[PDB]
Coordinates of C-alpha atoms and ligand atoms in Angstrom, one line a residue:
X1 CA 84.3 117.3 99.8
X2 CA 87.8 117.9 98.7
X3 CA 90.5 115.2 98.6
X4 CA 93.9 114.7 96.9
X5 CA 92.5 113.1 93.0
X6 CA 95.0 110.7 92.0
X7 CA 94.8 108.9 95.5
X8 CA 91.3 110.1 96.8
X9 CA 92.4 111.5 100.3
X10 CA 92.1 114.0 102.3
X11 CA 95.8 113.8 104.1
X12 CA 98.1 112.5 101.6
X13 CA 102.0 112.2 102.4
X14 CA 104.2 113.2 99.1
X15 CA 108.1 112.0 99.3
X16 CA 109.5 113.7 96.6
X17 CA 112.1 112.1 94.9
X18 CA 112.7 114.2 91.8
X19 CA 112.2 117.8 91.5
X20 CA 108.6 117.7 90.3
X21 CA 105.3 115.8 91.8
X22 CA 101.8 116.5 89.6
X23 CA 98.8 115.6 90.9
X24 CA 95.0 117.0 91.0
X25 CA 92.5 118.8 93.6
X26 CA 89.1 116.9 93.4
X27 CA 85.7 118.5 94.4
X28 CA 84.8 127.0 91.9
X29 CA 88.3 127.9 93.1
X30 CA 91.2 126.3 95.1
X31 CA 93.9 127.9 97.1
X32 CA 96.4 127.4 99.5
X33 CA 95.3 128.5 102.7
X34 CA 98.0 129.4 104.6
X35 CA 95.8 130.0 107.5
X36 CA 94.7 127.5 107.9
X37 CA 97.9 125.8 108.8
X38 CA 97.4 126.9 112.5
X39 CA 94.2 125.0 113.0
X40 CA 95.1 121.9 111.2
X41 CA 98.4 121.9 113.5
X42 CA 96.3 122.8 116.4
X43 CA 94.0 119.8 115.7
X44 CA 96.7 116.9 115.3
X45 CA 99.2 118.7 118.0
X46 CA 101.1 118.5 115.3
X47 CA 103.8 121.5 114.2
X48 CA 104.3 121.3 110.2
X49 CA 105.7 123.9 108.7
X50 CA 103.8 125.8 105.9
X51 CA 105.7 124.3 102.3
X52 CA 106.7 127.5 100.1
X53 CA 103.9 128.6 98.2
X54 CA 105.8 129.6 94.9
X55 CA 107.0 125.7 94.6
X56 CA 103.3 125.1 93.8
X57 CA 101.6 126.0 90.7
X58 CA 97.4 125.3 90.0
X59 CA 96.6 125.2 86.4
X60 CA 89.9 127.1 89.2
X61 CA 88.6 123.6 88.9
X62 CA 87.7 122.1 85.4
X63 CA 85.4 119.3 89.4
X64 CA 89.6 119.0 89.3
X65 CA 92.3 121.0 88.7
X66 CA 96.1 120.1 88.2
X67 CA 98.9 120.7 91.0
X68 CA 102.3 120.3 90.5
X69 CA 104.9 120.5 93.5
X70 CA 108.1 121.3 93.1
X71 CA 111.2 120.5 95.0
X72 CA 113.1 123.0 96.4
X73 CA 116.6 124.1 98.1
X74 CA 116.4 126.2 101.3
X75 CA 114.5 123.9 103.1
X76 CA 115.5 121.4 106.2
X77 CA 115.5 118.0 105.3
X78 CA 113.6 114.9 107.6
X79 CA 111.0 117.5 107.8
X80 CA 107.5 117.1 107.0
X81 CA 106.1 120.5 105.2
X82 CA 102.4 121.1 104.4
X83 CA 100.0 122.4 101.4
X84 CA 96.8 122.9 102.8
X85 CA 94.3 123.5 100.0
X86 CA 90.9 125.2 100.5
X87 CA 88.1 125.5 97.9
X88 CA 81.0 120.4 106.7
X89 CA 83.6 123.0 107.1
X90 CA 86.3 120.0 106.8
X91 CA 85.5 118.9 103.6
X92 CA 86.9 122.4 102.4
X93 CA 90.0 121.5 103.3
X94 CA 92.3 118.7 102.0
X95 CA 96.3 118.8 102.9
X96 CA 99.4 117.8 101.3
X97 CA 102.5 116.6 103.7
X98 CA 105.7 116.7 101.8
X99 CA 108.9 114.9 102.1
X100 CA 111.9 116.3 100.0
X101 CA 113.7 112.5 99.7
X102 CA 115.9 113.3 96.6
X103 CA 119.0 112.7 99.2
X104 CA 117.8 109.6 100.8
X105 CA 116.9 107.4 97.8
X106 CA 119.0 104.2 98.4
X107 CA 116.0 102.0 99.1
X108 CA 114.0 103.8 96.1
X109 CA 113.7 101.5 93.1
X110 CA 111.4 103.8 91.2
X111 CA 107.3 104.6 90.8
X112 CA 105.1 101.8 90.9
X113 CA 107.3 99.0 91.9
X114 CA 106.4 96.6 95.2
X115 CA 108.2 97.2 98.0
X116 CA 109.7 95.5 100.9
X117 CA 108.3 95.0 104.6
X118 CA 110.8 93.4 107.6
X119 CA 110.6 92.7 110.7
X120 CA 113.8 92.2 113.0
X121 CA 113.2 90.3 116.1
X122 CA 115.5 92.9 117.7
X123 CA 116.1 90.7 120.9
X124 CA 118.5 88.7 119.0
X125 CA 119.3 90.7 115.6
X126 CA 120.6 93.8 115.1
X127 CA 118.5 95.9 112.7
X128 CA 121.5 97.3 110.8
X129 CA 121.6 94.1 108.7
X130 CA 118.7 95.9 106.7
X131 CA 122.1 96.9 104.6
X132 CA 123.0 93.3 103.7
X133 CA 120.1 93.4 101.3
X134 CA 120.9 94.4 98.6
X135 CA 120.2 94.6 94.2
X136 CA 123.2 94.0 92.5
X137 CA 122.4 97.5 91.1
X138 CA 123.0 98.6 94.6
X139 CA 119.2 99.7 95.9
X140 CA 118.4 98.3 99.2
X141 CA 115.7 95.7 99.1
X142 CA 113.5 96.5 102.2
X143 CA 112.1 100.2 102.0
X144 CA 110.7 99.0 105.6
X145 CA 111.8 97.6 108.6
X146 CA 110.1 96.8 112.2
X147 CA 111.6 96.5 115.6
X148 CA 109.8 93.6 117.0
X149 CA 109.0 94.7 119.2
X150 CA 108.0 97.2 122.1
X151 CA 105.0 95.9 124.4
X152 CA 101.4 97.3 125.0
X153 CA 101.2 96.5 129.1
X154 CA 99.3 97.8 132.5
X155 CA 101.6 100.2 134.0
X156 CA 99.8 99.1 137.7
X157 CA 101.3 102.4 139.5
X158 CA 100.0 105.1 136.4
X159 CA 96.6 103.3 136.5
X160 CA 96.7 103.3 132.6
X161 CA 98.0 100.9 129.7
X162 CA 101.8 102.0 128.6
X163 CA 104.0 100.9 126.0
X164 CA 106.4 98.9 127.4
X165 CA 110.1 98.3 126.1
X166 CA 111.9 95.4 127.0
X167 CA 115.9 95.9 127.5
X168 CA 116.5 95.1 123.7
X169 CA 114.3 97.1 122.7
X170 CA 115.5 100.5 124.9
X171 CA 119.0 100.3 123.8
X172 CA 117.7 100.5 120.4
X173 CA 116.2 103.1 121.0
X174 CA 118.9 104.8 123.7
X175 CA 120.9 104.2 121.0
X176 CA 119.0 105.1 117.5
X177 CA 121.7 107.5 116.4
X178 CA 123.9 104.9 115.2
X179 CA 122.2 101.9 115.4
X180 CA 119.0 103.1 113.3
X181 CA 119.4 106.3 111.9
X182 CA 122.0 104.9 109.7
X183 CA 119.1 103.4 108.4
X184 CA 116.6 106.2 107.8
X185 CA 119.8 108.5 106.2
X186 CA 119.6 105.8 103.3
X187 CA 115.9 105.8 102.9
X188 CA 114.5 103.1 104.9
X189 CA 111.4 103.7 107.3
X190 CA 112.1 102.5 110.6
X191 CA 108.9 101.6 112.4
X192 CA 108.2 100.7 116.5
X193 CA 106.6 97.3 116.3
X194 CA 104.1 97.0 119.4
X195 CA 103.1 93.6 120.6
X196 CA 100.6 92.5 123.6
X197 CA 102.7 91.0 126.2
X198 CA 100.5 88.4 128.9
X199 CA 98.4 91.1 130.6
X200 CA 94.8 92.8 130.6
X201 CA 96.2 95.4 127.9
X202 CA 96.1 94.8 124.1
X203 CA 95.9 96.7 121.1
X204 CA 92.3 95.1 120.4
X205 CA 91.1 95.8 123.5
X206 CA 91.5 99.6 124.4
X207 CA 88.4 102.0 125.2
X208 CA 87.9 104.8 123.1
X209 CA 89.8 107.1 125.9
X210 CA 92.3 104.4 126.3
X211 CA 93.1 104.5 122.4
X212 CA 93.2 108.3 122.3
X213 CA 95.6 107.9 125.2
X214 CA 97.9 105.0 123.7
X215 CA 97.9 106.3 120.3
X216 CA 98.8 109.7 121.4
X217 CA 101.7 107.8 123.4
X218 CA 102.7 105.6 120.4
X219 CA 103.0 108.9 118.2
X220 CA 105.6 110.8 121.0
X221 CA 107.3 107.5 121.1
X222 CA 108.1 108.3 117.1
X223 CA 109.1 111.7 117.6
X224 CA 111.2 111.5 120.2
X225 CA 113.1 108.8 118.4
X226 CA 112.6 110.0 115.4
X227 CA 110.9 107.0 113.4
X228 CA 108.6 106.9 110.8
X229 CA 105.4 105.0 112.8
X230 CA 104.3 102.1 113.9
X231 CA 103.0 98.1 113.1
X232 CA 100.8 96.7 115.4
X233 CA 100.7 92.8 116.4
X234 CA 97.4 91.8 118.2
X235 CA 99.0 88.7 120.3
X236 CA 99.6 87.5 123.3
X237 CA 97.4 89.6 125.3
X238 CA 95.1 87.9 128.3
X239 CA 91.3 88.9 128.7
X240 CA 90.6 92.1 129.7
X241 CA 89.6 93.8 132.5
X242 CA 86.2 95.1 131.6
X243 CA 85.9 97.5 134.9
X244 CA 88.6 99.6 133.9
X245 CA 88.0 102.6 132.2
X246 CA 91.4 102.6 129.6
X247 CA 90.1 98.5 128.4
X248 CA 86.9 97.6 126.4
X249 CA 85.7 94.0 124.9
X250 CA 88.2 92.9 122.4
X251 CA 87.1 93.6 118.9
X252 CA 88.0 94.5 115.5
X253 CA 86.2 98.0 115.6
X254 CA 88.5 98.3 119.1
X255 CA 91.5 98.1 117.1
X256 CA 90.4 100.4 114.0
X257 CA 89.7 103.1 116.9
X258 CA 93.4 102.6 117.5
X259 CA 94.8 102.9 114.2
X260 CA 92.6 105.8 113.4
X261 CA 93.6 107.7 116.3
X262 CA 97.2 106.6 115.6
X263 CA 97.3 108.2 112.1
X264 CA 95.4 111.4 113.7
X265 CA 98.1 111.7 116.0
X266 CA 101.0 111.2 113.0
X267 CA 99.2 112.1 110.0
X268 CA 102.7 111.7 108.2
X269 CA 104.0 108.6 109.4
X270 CA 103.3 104.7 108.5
X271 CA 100.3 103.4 110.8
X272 CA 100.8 99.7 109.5
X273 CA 99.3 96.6 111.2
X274 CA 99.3 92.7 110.9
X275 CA 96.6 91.3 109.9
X276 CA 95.6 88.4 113.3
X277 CA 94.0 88.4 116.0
X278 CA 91.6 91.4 116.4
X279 CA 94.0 94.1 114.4
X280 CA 91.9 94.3 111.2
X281 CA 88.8 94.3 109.5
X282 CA 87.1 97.5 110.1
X283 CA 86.9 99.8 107.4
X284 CA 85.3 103.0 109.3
X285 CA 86.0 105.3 112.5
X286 CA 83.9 108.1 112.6
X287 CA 83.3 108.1 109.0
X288 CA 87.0 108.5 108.1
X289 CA 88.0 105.7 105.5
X290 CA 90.6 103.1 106.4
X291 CA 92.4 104.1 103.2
X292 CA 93.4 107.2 105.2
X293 CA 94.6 105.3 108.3
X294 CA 96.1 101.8 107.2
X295 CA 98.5 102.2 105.5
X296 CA 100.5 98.9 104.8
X297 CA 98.5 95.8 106.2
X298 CA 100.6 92.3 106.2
X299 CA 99.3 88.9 106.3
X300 CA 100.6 85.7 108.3
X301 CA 103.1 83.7 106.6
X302 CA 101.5 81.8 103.8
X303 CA 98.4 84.3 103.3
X304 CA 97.8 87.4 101.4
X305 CA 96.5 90.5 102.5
X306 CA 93.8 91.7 101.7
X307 CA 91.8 95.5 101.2
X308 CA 88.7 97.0 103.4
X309 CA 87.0 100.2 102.5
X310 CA 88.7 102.0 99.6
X311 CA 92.2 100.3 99.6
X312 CA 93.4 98.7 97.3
X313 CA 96.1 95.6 97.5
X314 CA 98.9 98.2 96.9
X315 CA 98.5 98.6 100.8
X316 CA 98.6 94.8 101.0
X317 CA 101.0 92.5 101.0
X318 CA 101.2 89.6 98.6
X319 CA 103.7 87.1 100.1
X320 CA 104.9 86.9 104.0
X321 CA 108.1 84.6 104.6
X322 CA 108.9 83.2 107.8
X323 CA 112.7 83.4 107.8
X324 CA 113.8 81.3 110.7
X325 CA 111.2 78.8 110.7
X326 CA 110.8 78.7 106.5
X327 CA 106.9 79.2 106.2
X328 CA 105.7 81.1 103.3
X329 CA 107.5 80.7 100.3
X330 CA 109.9 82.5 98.6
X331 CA 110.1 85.2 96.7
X332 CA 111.0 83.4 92.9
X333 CA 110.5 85.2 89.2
X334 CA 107.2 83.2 88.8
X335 CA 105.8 84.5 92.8
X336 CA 107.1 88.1 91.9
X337 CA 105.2 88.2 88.7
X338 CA 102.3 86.5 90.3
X339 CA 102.1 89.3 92.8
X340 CA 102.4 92.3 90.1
X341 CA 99.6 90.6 88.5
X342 CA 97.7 90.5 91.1
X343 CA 98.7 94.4 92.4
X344 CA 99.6 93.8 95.4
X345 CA 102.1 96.5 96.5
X346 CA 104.6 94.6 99.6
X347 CA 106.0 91.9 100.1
X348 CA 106.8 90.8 104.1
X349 CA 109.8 89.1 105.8
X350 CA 110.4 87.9 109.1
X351 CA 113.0 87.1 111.6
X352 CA 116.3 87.0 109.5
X353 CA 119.9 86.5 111.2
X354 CA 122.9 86.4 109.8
X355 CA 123.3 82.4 110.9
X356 CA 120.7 81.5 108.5
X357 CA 121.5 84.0 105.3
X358 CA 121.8 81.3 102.8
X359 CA 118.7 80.1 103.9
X360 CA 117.1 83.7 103.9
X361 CA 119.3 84.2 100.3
X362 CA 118.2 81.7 99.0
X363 CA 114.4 82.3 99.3
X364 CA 115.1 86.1 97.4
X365 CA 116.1 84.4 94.4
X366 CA 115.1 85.2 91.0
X367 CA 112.4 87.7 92.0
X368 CA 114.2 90.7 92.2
X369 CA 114.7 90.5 88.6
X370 CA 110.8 91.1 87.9
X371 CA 110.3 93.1 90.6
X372 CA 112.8 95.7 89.5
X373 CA 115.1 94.5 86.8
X374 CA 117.9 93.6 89.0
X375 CA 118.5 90.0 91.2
X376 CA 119.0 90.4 94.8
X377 CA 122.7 90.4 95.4
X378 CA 124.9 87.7 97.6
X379 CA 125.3 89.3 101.0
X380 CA 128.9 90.7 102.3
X381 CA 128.5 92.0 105.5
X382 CA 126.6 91.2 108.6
X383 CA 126.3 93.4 112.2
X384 CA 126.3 91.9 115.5
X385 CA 123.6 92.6 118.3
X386 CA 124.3 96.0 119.6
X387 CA 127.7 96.8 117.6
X388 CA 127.7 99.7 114.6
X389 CA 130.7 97.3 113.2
X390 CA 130.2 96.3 109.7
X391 CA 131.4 92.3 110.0
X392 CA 132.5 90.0 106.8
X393 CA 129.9 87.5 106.1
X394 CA 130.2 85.0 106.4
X395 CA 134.0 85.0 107.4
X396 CA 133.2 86.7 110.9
X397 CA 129.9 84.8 112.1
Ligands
LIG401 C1 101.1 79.3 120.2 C2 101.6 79.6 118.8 O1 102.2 78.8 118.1 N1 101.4 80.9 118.4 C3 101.7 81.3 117.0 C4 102.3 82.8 117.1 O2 103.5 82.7 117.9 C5 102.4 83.3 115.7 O3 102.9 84.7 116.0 C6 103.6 85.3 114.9 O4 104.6 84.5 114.4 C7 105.9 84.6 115.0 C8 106.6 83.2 114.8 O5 106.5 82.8 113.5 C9 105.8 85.0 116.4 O6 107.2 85.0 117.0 C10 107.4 84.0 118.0 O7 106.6 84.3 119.1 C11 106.8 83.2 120.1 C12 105.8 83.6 121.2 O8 106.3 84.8 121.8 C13 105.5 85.3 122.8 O9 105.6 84.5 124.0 C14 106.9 84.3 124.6 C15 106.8 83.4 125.8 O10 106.0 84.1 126.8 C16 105.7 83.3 127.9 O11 106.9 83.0 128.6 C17 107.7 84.1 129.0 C18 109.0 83.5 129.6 O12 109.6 82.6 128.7 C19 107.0 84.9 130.0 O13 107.8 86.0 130.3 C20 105.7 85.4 129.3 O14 104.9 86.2 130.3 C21 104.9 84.2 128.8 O15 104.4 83.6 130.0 C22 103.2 84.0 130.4 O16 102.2 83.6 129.5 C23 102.3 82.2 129.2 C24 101.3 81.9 128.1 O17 101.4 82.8 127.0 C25 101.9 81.4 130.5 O18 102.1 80.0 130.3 C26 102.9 81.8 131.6 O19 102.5 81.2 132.9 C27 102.9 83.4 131.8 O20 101.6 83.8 132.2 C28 107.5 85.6 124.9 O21 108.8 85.4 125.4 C29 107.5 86.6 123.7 O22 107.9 87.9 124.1 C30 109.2 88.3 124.0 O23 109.5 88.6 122.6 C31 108.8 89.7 122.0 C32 109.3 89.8 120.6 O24 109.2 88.5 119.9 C33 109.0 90.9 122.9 O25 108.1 91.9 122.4 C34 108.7 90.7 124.3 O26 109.1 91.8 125.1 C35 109.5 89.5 124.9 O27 110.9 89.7 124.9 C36 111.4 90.0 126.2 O28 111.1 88.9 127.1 C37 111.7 87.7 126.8 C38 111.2 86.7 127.9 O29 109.7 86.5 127.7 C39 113.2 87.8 126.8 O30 113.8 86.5 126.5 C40 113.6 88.8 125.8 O31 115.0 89.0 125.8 C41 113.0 90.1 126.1 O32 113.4 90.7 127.3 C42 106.0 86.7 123.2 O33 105.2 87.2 124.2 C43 108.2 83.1 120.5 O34 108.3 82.0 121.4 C44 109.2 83.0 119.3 O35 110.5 83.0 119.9 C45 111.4 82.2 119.2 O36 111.8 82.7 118.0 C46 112.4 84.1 118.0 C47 112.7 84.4 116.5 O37 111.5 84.5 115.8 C48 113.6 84.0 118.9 O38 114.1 85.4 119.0 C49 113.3 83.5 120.3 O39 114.4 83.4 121.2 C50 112.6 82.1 120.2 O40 113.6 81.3 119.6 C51 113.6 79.9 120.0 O41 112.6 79.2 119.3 C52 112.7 79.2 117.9 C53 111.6 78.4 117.4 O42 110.3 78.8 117.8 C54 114.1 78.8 117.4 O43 114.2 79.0 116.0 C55 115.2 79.5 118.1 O44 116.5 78.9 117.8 C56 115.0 79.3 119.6 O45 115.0 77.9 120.0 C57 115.3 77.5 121.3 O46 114.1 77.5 122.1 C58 113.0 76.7 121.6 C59 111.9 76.9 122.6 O47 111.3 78.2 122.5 C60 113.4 75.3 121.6 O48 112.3 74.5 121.0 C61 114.7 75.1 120.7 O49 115.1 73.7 120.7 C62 115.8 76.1 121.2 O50 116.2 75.6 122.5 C63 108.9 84.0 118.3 O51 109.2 85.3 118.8 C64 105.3 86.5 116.4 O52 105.0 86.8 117.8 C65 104.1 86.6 115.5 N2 104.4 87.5 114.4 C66 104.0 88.8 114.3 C67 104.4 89.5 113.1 O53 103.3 89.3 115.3 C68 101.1 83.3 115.1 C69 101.0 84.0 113.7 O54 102.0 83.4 112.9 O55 100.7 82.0 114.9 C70 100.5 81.3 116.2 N3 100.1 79.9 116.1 C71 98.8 79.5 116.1 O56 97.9 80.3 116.3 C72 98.6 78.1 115.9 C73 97.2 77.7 115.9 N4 96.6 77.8 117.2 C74 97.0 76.3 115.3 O57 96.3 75.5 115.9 O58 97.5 76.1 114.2

């Protein structure tokens, strides 16, 4: 089969953030099969554009050869354009899905660096204090940020599970023009968290029609509100209801289903999950590699994550902090270092508000430094629940 070289997939997202990306085809000949752009689209329901073919140069395969992308200037940005490559009849194929991000780089600090992972409990904080964090060189810590969170539950009169949004949660979302696409035009990626919520429904615990159906939801729920995927939670769900046809045992292989038909369903956005409950372990569906369907896992405060199948800990996180109950540590010069030697690729936060930033502050100390050359700066501003107004902090808490 043919995959992508440098990260051994078959679907691999490129965000461009200079003018050139180089990479190899990995089995002869390849091509870009413009043709084959219909069927691929046609498979995911998916509607990709086909990424102009003179902005990609082959040095026939040495078996590899060398690709280089290049950025270009008609195109649309926040749209996801596609290299198929052709040399079962799949594993002729492999496909590039390319992001031109040279205009939304604030939360870029460069190639190889860990990255930041935080989740807002959006009931109570408003997730536009992602833009209090900050490097005094002025990149914005946390290249991504959840809404915790929309539910998985029954919808009784549909006969099927739904995702489920409380009334924080849909006016974020009636609302994601200025209270999270502020966000996204600076670089972050805004995921949907999705949480069980007290009934027979969970995100463990779905047949394989019921997880077809429920991804495939999950994915219109990020296109419609234009958000770059989804983290999973496996809580707080009851037993399930074994006679329906949309609910299965609870397992581990139940969940991979999910996240597997998730990424089928948005093949170029983040299908990310926390690692509890049921969520994670399996490392197959249908002999598709998690590598090509997880792609950030995050560990409960005071763990690491860890890698199945051909990830590596650049998917994984290497310190989770609990910000408004203090588990987990805090991100210092000697933990950063730590976690670079150790490759892991994210670090995760939790719960911050702006009543407990010296707290939160306090716990980014030192690290930024080794992560990136540059401390994490004091924090000015602050946003109340449901307001675009930028606030004084801490004068105006
Ligand atoms: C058990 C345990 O412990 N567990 C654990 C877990 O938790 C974890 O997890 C993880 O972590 C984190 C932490 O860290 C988390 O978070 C958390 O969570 C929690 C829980 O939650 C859940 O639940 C709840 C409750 O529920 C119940 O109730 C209700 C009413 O109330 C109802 O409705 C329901 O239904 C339920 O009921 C049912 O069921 C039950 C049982 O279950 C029974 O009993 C009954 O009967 C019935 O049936 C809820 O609520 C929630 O939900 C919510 O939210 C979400 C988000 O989050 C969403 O999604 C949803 O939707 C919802 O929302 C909505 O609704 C609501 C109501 O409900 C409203 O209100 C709203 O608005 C909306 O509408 C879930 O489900 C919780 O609790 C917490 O919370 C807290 O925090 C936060 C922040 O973070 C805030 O925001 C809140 O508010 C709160 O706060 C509070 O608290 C705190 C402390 O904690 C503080 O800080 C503050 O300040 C406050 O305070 C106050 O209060 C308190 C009490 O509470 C007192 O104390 C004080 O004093 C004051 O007053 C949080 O959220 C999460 O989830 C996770 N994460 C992730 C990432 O995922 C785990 C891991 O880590 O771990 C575990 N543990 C263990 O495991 C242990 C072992 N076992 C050993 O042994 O060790």
């Amino acid at each position: 089969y043919l995959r992508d070289g440098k990260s051994n997939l078959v679907s691999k997202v490129v965000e461009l953030h200079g003018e050139t990306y180089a990479t190899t085809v990995k089995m002869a000949k390849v091509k870009i099969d413009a043709a084959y752009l219909e069927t691929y689209n046609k498979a995911h329901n998916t509607d990709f554009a086909l990424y102009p073919q003179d902005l990609v140069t082959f040095a026939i395969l040495t078996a590899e050869v060398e690709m280089t992308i290049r950025a270009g200037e008609g195109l649309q940005e926040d749209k996801t354009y596609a290299i198929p490559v052709a040399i079962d009849e799949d594993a002729k194929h492999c496909i590039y899905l390319v992001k031109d991000m040279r205009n939304a780089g604030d939360a870029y600090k460069g190639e190889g660096v860990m990255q930041g992972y935080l989740f807002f409990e959006v009931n109570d904080v408003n997730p536009l204090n992602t833009l209090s964090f900050q490097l005094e060189n002025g990149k914005l810590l946390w290249d991504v940020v959840v809404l915790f969170a929309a539910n998985i539950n029954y919808d009784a009169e549909a006969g099927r599970p739904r995702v489920q949004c409380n009334p924080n949660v849909q006016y974020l979302l009636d609302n994601n023009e200025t209270l999270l696409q502020p966000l996204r035009r600076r670089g972050v990626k805004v995921l949907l968290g999705l949480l069980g919520n007290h009934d027979i429904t969970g995100l463990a615990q779905l047949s394989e029609q019921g997880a077809k159906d429920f991804a495939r939801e999950v994915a219109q729920y990020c296109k419609a509100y234009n958000l770059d995927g989804v983290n999973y939670a496996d809580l707080y769900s009851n037993s399930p209801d074994l006679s329906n046809p949309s609910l299965t045992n609870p397992s581990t292989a139940a969940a991979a289903r999910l996240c597997y038909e998730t990424k089928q369903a948005m093949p170029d956005k983040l299908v990310t999950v926390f690692d509890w409950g049921q969520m994670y372990g399996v490392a197959t569906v249908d002999g598709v590699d998690a590598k090509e369907w997880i792609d950030i896992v995050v560990a409960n405060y005071g763990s690491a994550a860890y890698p199945i199948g051909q990830m590596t800990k650049k998917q994984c996180s290497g310190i989770s902090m609990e910000f408004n109950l203090g588990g987990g540590g805090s991100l210092s010069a000697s933990k950063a270092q730590s976690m670079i030697d150790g490759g892991y690729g994210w670090f995760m936060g939790f719960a911050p508000s702006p009543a407990k930033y010296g707290s939160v502050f306090s716990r980014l100390q030192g690290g930024g430094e080794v992560l990136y050359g540059s401390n994490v700066a004091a924090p000015t501003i602050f946003y109340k629940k449901n307001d675009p107004t930028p606030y004084k902090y801490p004068d105006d808490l």
